Design a binder for this molecule. Structure first.
Ligand SMILES: O=C(Cc1c[nH]c2ccc(Br)cc12)NO
Ligand SMILES: [Zn+2]
Ligand SMILES: [Zn+2]
Ligand SMILES: [Zn+2]
Ligand SMILES: [Zn+2]
Ligand SMILES: [Zn+2]
Length: 180
């Protein structure tokens, strides 16, 4: 298994509905949760393992045995709160990079679960926060898109480094450059 990283395009590709709700789907969520636990994270959205399908899993506590291992599939934000708050985020598709992103305090959400049931959770604190972070992955949108002109100024050079690693490995030019 392996985490996809920035500039890699699978990060921007349209993400599909899921509809069979089979056993493979259980099996996927093992491996998303386990890769998460292995890289010490608190969320992970499926295109970060190379699958373009709306599926995110996560667990605020982010340590085994602790918190609560939530799964949303086909999320949609019904509502976003007015309240706005900063927070240093990291994202695994950007090894080692943390920069402050500013986002809505709470969200209401509609979504299916691992057996198909729709449902309807609201969400705050860290939970909500991650939710959104993975919620963006589902939808083409990476954390530095959410940063303020100044902040991004602080990571230009790092994400540039990434673009080059991609370029060295792939032979191809970086399908997207942050000087853009
Ligand atoms: O790469 C990841 C997981 C992750 C790791 N460290 C974090 C700190 C803040 C936030 Br919000 C998310 C993370 N999700 O796409
Ligand atoms: Zn592997
Ligand atoms: Zn299908
Ligand atoms: Zn497991
Ligand atoms: Zn930890
Ligand atoms: Zn991420």
């Amino acid at each position: 298994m392996e985490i996809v990283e920035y500039p890699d395009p699978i990060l921007r590709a349209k993400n599909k509905r899921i509809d069979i709700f089979d056993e493979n789907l259980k099996n996927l969520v093992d491996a998303m949760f386990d890769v998460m636990y292995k890289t010490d994270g608190i969320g992970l959205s499926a295109p970060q393992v190379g699958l373009n399908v709306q599926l995110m899993v996560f667990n605020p506590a982010g340590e085994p045995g602790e918190g609560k291992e939530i799964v949303l599939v086909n999320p949609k934000i019904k509502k976003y709160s007015d309240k706005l708050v900063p927070f240093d985020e990291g994202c695994l598709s950007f090894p080692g990079i943390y920069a402050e992103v500013v986002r809505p305090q709470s969200v209401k959400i509609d979504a299916r679960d691992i057996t198909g049931e729709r449902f309807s959770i609201s969400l705050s604190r860290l939970p909500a926060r991650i939710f959104q972070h993975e919620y963006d992955h589902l939808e083409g949108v990476l954390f530095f898109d959410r940063m303020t002109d100044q902040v991004l100024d602080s990571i230009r050079e790092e994400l540039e480094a990434l673009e080059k690693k991609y370029e060295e490995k792939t032979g191809l030019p970086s399908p997207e450059r942050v000087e853009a």
